[PDB]
Amino acid sequence: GGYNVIALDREYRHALVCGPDRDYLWINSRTPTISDEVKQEMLAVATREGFDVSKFIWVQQPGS
Amino acid sequence: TPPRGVTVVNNFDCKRYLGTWYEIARFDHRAERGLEKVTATYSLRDDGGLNVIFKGYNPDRGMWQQYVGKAYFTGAPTRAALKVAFF
Ligand code: NA
């Protein structure tokens, strides 16, 4: 299966990752939680590239 | 092949991507559905590929479970396009 980093900040702390098509997408962090600011920028990259962000499941993590 | 009309990162330093990433959000599929506290851990193979260790908590089985995979760059290691297999 295809695996592609389609966004990444400068200190490799936050990544947007998609599969071979727009049914596969993940938001990853070096920390268990991200900030709204960081969330909105991620959603904003997802939408700009045509991903249906209503499909996100917000995964249980320590502090969430 | 990546989806049609997407940007892939093109200045890519593999070594700096390694180690542990928490999964904040996912589009659901059978492989992951219901899993909690998910991380993926990336490490460099002898053959220049990446090892991928996916880990999550399974509340219905009451166990931590992992999936073991390998990833290969489809083009150059400076472009973050890859194929993943799990065995
Ligand atoms: Na908690």
Residue numbers in the entry:
A (entry chain B): 114 to 177
B (entry chain A): 23 to 109
Authors' description from the paper:
Later, proteins capable of binding and increasing the fluorescent signals of fluorogenic molecules became commonly referred to as fluorogen activating proteins (FAPs). In silico shortlisting with the further screening of the lipocalin Blc mutants launched DiBs FAPs tags family binding green and red BODIPY dyes. It suggests that the easier task of fine-tuning the fluorogen-binding properties of an already functional protein in silico should be readily achievable. To test this hypothesis, we used Rosetta for computational ligand docking followed by protein binding pocket redesign to further improve the previously described FAP DiB1 that is capable of binding to a BODIPY-like dye M739. The designed protein, DiB-RM, shows higher brightness, localization precision, and apparent photostability in protein-PAINT super-resolution imaging compared to its parental variant DiB1.
Moreover, DiB-RM can be cleaved to obtain an efficient split system with enhanced performance compared to a parental DiB-split system. Despite no intentional optimization for it, the DiB-RM-based split protein (DiB-RM-split) created analogously to the previously tested DiB2-split system also behaved better. We have not observed aggregation in the separately expressed N1-109 fragment, and the split protein successfully assembled in living cells without the need of including the additional overlapping β strand in the C fragment. Regardless of lower brightness both in vitro and in super-resolution microscopy set up as well as less stable fluorescent signal compared to full-length DiB-RM tag, we speculate that the DiB-RM-split should be a scaffold of choice for further DiB-split system optimizations.
